[PDB]
Amino acid sequence: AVPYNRMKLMIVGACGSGKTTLLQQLMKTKKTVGIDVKDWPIQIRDKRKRDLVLNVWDFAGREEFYSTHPHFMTQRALYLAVYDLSKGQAEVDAMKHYLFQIKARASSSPVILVGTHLDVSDEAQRAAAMSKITKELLNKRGFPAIRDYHFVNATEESDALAKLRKTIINESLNFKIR
Amino acid sequence: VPYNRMKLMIVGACGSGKTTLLQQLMKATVGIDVKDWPIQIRDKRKRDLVLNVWDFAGREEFYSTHPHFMTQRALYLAVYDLSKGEVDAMKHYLFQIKARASSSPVILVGTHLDVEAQRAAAMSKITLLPAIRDYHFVNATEESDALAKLRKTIINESLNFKIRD
Ligand SMILES: *CCC(=O)N1CCN(c2nc(OC[C@@H]3CCCN3C)nc3c(F)c(-c4nc(N)cc(C)c4C(F)(F)F)c(Cl)cc23)[C@@H](C)C1
Ligand SMILES: *CCC(=O)N1CCN(c2nc(OC[C@@H]3CCCN3C)nc3c(F)c(-c4nc(N)cc(C)c4C(F)(F)F)c(Cl)cc23)[C@@H](C)C1
Ligand SMILES: Nc1nc2c(ncn2[C@@H]2O[C@H](COP(=O)(O)OP(=O)(O)O)[C@@H](O)[C@H]2O)c(=O)[nH]1
Ligand SMILES: Nc1nc2c(ncn2[C@@H]2O[C@H](COP(=O)(O)OP(=O)(O)O)[C@@H](O)[C@H]2O)c(=O)[nH]1
Ligand SMILES: [Br-]
Ligand SMILES: [Br-]
Ligand SMILES: [Br-]
Ligand SMILES: [F-]
Ligand SMILES: [Mg+2]
Ligand SMILES: [Mg+2]
């Protein structure tokens, strides 16, 4: 059983979406874990046999963490689906791949959409993104339960960011209730 | 072109020679930053919340080649230091793996062969015999016949697990 005070947050999205930047800005308070995943083409170029490619997981960090986080590799988590608003509606459409992945591999997990790069976006992009979110993503079959969607500047502190923090707390607790 | 996929989990006590063995076995890497975020703590009125946060890196190609790299169904490499006599500690990992993935296969690997008649005693305890599909004793620091044999064992067990019968 997951410890009463713990659960997982998965930050997913295309490269350049501002995922690492958003996480840096969201976390003002911290507190070992290490995971190296490597691609290993262990059987290739064999004339008769199909190729075999392994994804290999190598773990680092302190033993205490792994004792305190018994289910830390579960797929059941809160997901932040992050995209660059300044890249236009095509980026929201690209996000659908991530959303499908979440719906298939973790059908019960909730999602919060986060559009970064709000400071370098124009209102037409904001309105188009919101329109597409509400007309194509919210409560549509084949997509996970999108509980909220935000538009932020991931590079600095602001009220929108504190709002996202509170949404994250609230949705995590909603998920803990199951 | 069709090709076969599988996940390999390398477990064992710290210092067992896991990273060295994997480096030697392998003759678009992915990096995962996992951090604890105490987003709600120390307020006596409010339930605490500490989030385990995963941030992903690497080339997108990996994710096309391993779409399900987060699955729990995997082959396990249980690595231990033979020179420590560590042999009893490994059992806990097996229990974890046996409980968390009763269907996953296991390959035990004793490193530190160069530094072992005592190592032979380990075999006694193994015969501890999750589905323990093979048992090996190698030196993870250099190429050798036992190492290539373990390579082939890994191939064969990966396919046995993925392919039904
Ligand atoms: C700059 C590199 C970087 O930030 N990342 C982020 C994570 N990531 C990624 N990429 C893809 O797709 C890349 C392209 C787009 C079309 C398909 N592919 C060729 N997919 C990802 C995922 F599907 C996941 C993922 N994987 C599993 N097994 C389950 C779940 C629920 C997910 C999901 F994201 F949805 F949460 C992940 Cl973790 C990451 C993916 C790369 C771009 C590298
Ligand atoms: C040098 C540091 C290093 O390489 N590592 C990797 C191993 N590791 C670690 N340590 C512990 O504590 C010891 C005991 C023995 C049984 C497991 N544990 C309670 N535990 C680890 C784990 F439990 C895991 C693990 N965690 C989860 N959630 C699931 C599963 C299936 C496992 C595992 F694969 F091991 F079975 C892991 Cl991945 C690593 C553990 C550190 C010392 C860091
Ligand atoms: N102006 C601006 N730049 C941002 C914002 N979010 C991220 N970036 C930048 O965009 C690039 C991608 O950020 P990064 O966190 O690496 O995205 P990731 O690949 O999804 O992890 C970096 O140069 C970031 O500094 C934002 O809200 N505004
Ligand atoms: N002599 C010898 N040294 C080994 C062997 N396997 C690993 N080592 C060394 O023992 C240490 C193990 O470190 P590492 O690979 O990080 O162990 P891990 O924490 O279990 O991954 C390193 O200094 C390795 O070079 C082995 O078979 N023989
Ligand atoms: Br905080
Ligand atoms: Br787990
Ligand atoms: Br998966
Ligand atoms: F698969
Ligand atoms: Mg990043
Ligand atoms: Mg290591």
PDB file of C-alpha atoms in Angstrom, chain A residues 4-12 15 19-20 23 26-31 33 35-40 42-43 49-59 61 65 69-74 101 105 165 168-169 172-173 176, chain B residues 2-11 14 18-19 22 25-26 28-32 34-40 47-56 58 62 65-71 96 100 151-152 154-155 158-159:
ATOM      1  CA  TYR A   4      -0.668   7.830   3.254  1.00  0.00           C
ATOM      2  CA  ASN A   5       1.373  10.988   2.560  1.00  0.00           C
ATOM      3  CA  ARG A   6       2.969   9.975  -0.749  1.00  0.00           C
ATOM      4  CA  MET A   7       2.021   9.711  -4.397  1.00  0.00           C
ATOM      5  CA  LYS A   8       3.595  10.169  -7.804  1.00  0.00           C
ATOM      6  CA  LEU A   9       3.681  13.175 -10.130  1.00  0.00           C
ATOM      7  CA  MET A  10       4.566  12.502 -13.774  1.00  0.00           C
ATOM      8  CA  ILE A  11       5.678  15.506 -15.821  1.00  0.00           C
ATOM      9  CA  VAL A  12       5.330  14.568 -19.485  1.00  0.00           C
ATOM     10  CA  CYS A  15      10.894  18.441 -25.807  1.00  0.00           C
ATOM     11  CA  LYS A  19       8.868  20.649 -18.214  1.00  0.00           C
ATOM     12  CA  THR A  20      12.178  20.945 -16.365  1.00  0.00           C
ATOM     13  CA  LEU A  23       9.372  21.857 -12.210  1.00  0.00           C
ATOM     14  CA  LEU A  26       7.102  25.024  -8.917  1.00  0.00           C
ATOM     15  CA  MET A  27       9.395  23.540  -6.261  1.00  0.00           C
ATOM     16  CA  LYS A  28      10.563  26.077  -3.690  1.00  0.00           C
ATOM     17  CA  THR A  29      11.148  23.423  -1.007  1.00  0.00           C
ATOM     18  CA  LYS A  30      12.877  20.062  -1.416  1.00  0.00           C
ATOM     19  CA  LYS A  31      13.137  16.855   0.614  1.00  0.00           C
ATOM     20  CA  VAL A  33      17.009   8.508  -6.143  1.00  0.00           C
ATOM     21  CA  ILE A  35      17.502   5.997 -12.540  1.00  0.00           C
ATOM     22  CA  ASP A  36      19.549   5.467 -15.725  1.00  0.00           C
ATOM     23  CA  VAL A  37      17.634   3.805 -18.578  1.00  0.00           C
ATOM     24  CA  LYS A  38      19.738   2.652 -21.522  1.00  0.00           C
ATOM     25  CA  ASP A  39      18.934   1.331 -24.990  1.00  0.00           C
ATOM     26  CA  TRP A  40      20.720  -2.003 -25.547  1.00  0.00           C
ATOM     27  CA  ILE A  42      21.496  -6.972 -27.700  1.00  0.00           C
ATOM     28  CA  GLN A  43      20.637  -8.891 -30.907  1.00  0.00           C
ATOM     29  CA  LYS A  49      16.451 -13.905 -36.249  1.00  0.00           C
ATOM     30  CA  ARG A  50      14.497 -10.734 -35.610  1.00  0.00           C
ATOM     31  CA  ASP A  51      16.278  -7.994 -33.709  1.00  0.00           C
ATOM     32  CA  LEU A  52      15.985  -7.717 -29.916  1.00  0.00           C
ATOM     33  CA  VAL A  53      16.356  -4.362 -28.145  1.00  0.00           C
ATOM     34  CA  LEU A  54      16.267  -4.105 -24.352  1.00  0.00           C
ATOM     35  CA  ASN A  55      15.541  -1.004 -22.280  1.00  0.00           C
ATOM     36  CA  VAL A  56      17.744  -1.520 -19.198  1.00  0.00           C
ATOM     37  CA  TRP A  57      17.097   0.187 -15.845  1.00  0.00           C
ATOM     38  CA  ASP A  58      20.044   0.854 -13.507  1.00  0.00           C
ATOM     39  CA  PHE A  59      19.288   2.314 -10.082  1.00  0.00           C
ATOM     40  CA  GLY A  61      20.730   6.530  -4.613  1.00  0.00           C
ATOM     41  CA  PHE A  65      14.581   6.149  -0.275  1.00  0.00           C
ATOM     42  CA  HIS A  69       8.913   4.611  -1.342  1.00  0.00           C
ATOM     43  CA  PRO A  70       7.663   1.035  -1.821  1.00  0.00           C
ATOM     44  CA  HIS A  71       5.546   1.797  -4.922  1.00  0.00           C
ATOM     45  CA  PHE A  72       7.557   4.653  -6.424  1.00  0.00           C
ATOM     46  CA  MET A  73       7.583   3.046  -9.911  1.00  0.00           C
ATOM     47  CA  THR A  74       3.814   2.581 -10.220  1.00  0.00           C
ATOM     48  CA  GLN A 101      -0.378   6.969 -23.698  1.00  0.00           C
ATOM     49  CA  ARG A 105      -1.074   2.635 -19.752  1.00  0.00           C
ATOM     50  CA  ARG A 165       0.573  24.528  -7.032  1.00  0.00           C
ATOM     51  CA  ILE A 168      -1.715  20.086  -7.845  1.00  0.00           C
ATOM     52  CA  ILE A 169      -2.246  19.669  -4.087  1.00  0.00           C
ATOM     53  CA  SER A 172      -3.405  14.827  -5.638  1.00  0.00           C
ATOM     54  CA  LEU A 173      -5.759  14.618  -2.656  1.00  0.00           C
ATOM     55  CA  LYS A 176      -5.740   9.734  -2.964  1.00  0.00           C
TER      56      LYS A 176
ATOM     57  CA  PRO B   2       9.257  -6.173 -36.899  1.00  0.00           C
ATOM     58  CA  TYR B   3      11.527  -6.513 -33.873  1.00  0.00           C
ATOM     59  CA  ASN B   4      11.246  -7.786 -30.322  1.00  0.00           C
ATOM     60  CA  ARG B   5      11.261  -5.598 -27.215  1.00  0.00           C
ATOM     61  CA  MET B   6      11.851  -6.258 -23.545  1.00  0.00           C
ATOM     62  CA  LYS B   7      12.739  -4.546 -20.277  1.00  0.00           C
ATOM     63  CA  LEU B   8      15.697  -5.493 -18.077  1.00  0.00           C
ATOM     64  CA  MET B   9      15.763  -4.511 -14.387  1.00  0.00           C
ATOM     65  CA  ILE B  10      19.178  -4.712 -12.703  1.00  0.00           C
ATOM     66  CA  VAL B  11      18.764  -4.943  -8.916  1.00  0.00           C
ATOM     67  CA  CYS B  14      24.885  -1.068  -3.523  1.00  0.00           C
ATOM     68  CA  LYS B  18      25.640  -3.550 -11.361  1.00  0.00           C
ATOM     69  CA  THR B  19      26.693  -0.514 -13.397  1.00  0.00           C
ATOM     70  CA  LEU B  22      25.902  -3.496 -17.546  1.00  0.00           C
ATOM     71  CA  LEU B  25      27.667  -6.450 -21.282  1.00  0.00           C
ATOM     72  CA  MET B  26      26.852  -3.661 -23.767  1.00  0.00           C
ATOM     73  CA  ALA B  28      19.812   7.281 -27.229  1.00  0.00           C
ATOM     74  CA  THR B  29      20.111   7.024 -23.465  1.00  0.00           C
ATOM     75  CA  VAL B  30      17.245   8.207 -21.271  1.00  0.00           C
ATOM     76  CA  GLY B  31      17.646  10.127 -18.055  1.00  0.00           C
ATOM     77  CA  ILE B  32      15.027  10.288 -15.337  1.00  0.00           C
ATOM     78  CA  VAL B  34      13.238  11.607  -9.548  1.00  0.00           C
ATOM     79  CA  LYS B  35      12.824  14.063  -6.675  1.00  0.00           C
ATOM     80  CA  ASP B  36      10.651  14.386  -3.591  1.00  0.00           C
ATOM     81  CA  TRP B  37       8.496  17.539  -3.444  1.00  0.00           C
ATOM     82  CA  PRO B  38       7.127  18.159   0.078  1.00  0.00           C
ATOM     83  CA  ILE B  39       4.348  20.275  -1.397  1.00  0.00           C
ATOM     84  CA  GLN B  40       2.223  20.170   1.795  1.00  0.00           C
ATOM     85  CA  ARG B  47      -3.070  16.325   5.490  1.00  0.00           C
ATOM     86  CA  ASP B  48       0.547  16.072   4.430  1.00  0.00           C
ATOM     87  CA  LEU B  49       1.447  15.510   0.798  1.00  0.00           C
ATOM     88  CA  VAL B  50       4.900  14.595  -0.500  1.00  0.00           C
ATOM     89  CA  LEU B  51       5.030  14.004  -4.253  1.00  0.00           C
ATOM     90  CA  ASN B  52       7.533  11.762  -6.004  1.00  0.00           C
ATOM     91  CA  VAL B  53       8.170  13.730  -9.199  1.00  0.00           C
ATOM     92  CA  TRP B  54       9.547  12.208 -12.411  1.00  0.00           C
ATOM     93  CA  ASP B  55      11.125  14.381 -15.118  1.00  0.00           C
ATOM     94  CA  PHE B  56      12.257  12.680 -18.342  1.00  0.00           C
ATOM     95  CA  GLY B  58      16.810  11.816 -23.752  1.00  0.00           C
ATOM     96  CA  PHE B  62      14.122   5.795 -27.536  1.00  0.00           C
ATOM     97  CA  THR B  65      11.780   1.999 -29.841  1.00  0.00           C
ATOM     98  CA  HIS B  66      10.451   1.248 -26.324  1.00  0.00           C
ATOM     99  CA  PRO B  67       6.884   2.577 -26.071  1.00  0.00           C
ATOM    100  CA  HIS B  68       6.175   0.586 -22.885  1.00  0.00           C
ATOM    101  CA  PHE B  69       9.455   1.120 -21.025  1.00  0.00           C
ATOM    102  CA  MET B  70       7.451   1.825 -17.844  1.00  0.00           C
ATOM    103  CA  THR B  71       5.810  -1.625 -17.726  1.00  0.00           C
ATOM    104  CA  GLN B  96      10.308  -7.971  -3.414  1.00  0.00           C
ATOM    105  CA  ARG B 100       5.719  -7.301  -6.950  1.00  0.00           C
ATOM    106  CA  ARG B 151      24.612 -12.182 -22.601  1.00  0.00           C
ATOM    107  CA  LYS B 152      23.107 -15.185 -24.391  1.00  0.00           C
ATOM    108  CA  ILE B 154      19.673 -12.712 -21.201  1.00  0.00           C
ATOM    109  CA  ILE B 155      18.633 -12.942 -24.861  1.00  0.00           C
ATOM    110  CA  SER B 158      13.934 -12.216 -22.652  1.00  0.00           C
ATOM    111  CA  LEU B 159      12.440 -14.079 -25.601  1.00  0.00           C
TER     112      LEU B 159
END
